[PDB]
């Protein structure tokens, strides 16, 4: 074998964005909505392929959170999806091992909303977060109550409160 | 020639990320500061380059901000600089051509905030016309220094008369 790229949005041709949607689409049995693919788009992509066709993919998005009364800077993974027949050989692993690599490089703290999927980020060194969760809407932050448990974080450094409190920003669709 | 290269933070050595620091710093007359440095890294950059010689960049980070009570998905640019011997010679506005094509590519808006505006007039950019709000103490203010001063390129359409709310960080918000 599998070849992996890292690619920005801008740096995606329009067929690798295609194939991303049918790829995202098919992975997630059509559980994966329009504002979910608008929340994959305008970060980091790390591609897996096998010769010419595209079989993985992870995405990292930059968002601005704050960490209690602190503002952090967040590498967001989004849409993490492998074909269905490529799956349980490990090519979902070394997509997080490229994530975190680039998390390691430009953000302060990673992190996203797993399903069921949580071994496979555990097993890269992400942990369950602890604190409470809110997030904007109707105008004020109310906790996401539905997230608490199910949100994960990781520090290259570690050195990180994960019983804090996190705020994220405002988006479309599903915040976390 | 000045060769132009785009690449992710991510994508950069800590050399270049060193090069970087120092341009900003020579360009600005040490009028920017270590927050801003960090308001420059986690996105795209666009490099201008005279051989090997770093002379020129600007990069363009995501935000999340809101349009009135609307999300929009923000191309905002940070850190235009061009060394000093280089200016007045096109560099800046090949600068925003590539940094209009990667807003246009990613996000609904693109942002800024100035300090001359021509050059960015001069590529399509407009100044936003309606209140800007920044986060001081965990609660909206009125971005009133600001206003006039933020120019929006349109990725096109966005009304440039509603309020604009900018997302959290450290340093100064716009
Ligand atoms: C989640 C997902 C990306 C995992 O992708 P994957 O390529 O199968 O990932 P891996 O192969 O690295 O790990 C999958 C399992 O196989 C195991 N495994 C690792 N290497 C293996 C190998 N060489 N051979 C066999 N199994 C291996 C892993 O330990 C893991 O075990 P687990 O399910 O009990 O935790 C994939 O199942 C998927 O696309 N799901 C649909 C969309 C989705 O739910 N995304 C996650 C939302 S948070
Ligand atoms: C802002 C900045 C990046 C402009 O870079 P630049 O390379 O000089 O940009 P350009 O050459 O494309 O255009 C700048 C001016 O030179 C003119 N110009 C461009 N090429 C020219 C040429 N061959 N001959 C004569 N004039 C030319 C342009 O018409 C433009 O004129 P204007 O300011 O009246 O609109 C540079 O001044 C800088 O680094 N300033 C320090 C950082 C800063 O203060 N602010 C960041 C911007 S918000
Ligand atoms: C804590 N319980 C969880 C639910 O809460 C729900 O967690 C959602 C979460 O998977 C989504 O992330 C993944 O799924 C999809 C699309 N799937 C939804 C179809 O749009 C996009 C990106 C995926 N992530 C990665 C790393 O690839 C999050 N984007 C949103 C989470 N929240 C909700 O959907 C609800 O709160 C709706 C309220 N607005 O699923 C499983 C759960 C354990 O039961
Ligand atoms: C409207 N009048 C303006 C002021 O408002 C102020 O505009 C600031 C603006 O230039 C800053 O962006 C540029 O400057 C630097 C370095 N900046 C100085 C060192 O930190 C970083 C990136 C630059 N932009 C681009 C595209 O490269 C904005 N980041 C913030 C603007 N606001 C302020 O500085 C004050 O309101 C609060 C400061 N505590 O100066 C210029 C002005 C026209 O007079």
Redesign the pocket.
């Known amino acids: 074998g599998i070849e992996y790229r890292s690619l920005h949005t801008s740096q995606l041709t329009l067929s690798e964005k295609e194939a991303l949607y049918d790829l995202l689409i098919e992975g997630?049995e059509g559980?994966?909505?329009h504002?979910?693919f608008a929340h994959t788009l305008g970060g980091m992509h790390v591609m897996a392929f096998d010769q010419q066709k595209l079989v993985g993919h992870v995405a990292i998005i930059q968002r601005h959170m704050a960490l209690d009364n602190t503002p952090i800077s967040v590498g967001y993974?989004?849409?993490?999806?492998v074909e269905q027949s490529y799956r349980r050989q490990g090519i979902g692993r070394q997509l997080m091992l490229q994530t975190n690599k680039i998390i390691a490089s430009c953000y302060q703290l990673g992190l996203?909303?797993?399903?069921?999927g949580q071994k496979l980020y555990h097993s890269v060194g992400w942990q369950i977060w602890k604190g409470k969760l809110f997030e904007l809407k109707q105008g004020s932050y109310i906790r996401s109550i539905?997230?608490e448990?199910?949100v994960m974080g990781w520090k290259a450094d570690g050195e990180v409160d994960f019983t804090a409190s996190l705020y994220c920003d405002f988006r479309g669709?599903?915040?976390?």
Do not use: I, K, N, R
């Open positions: 997630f559980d994966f909505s504002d979910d993974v989004e849409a993490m999806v996203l909303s797993a399903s069921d539905e997230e448990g199910g669709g599903d915040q976390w």
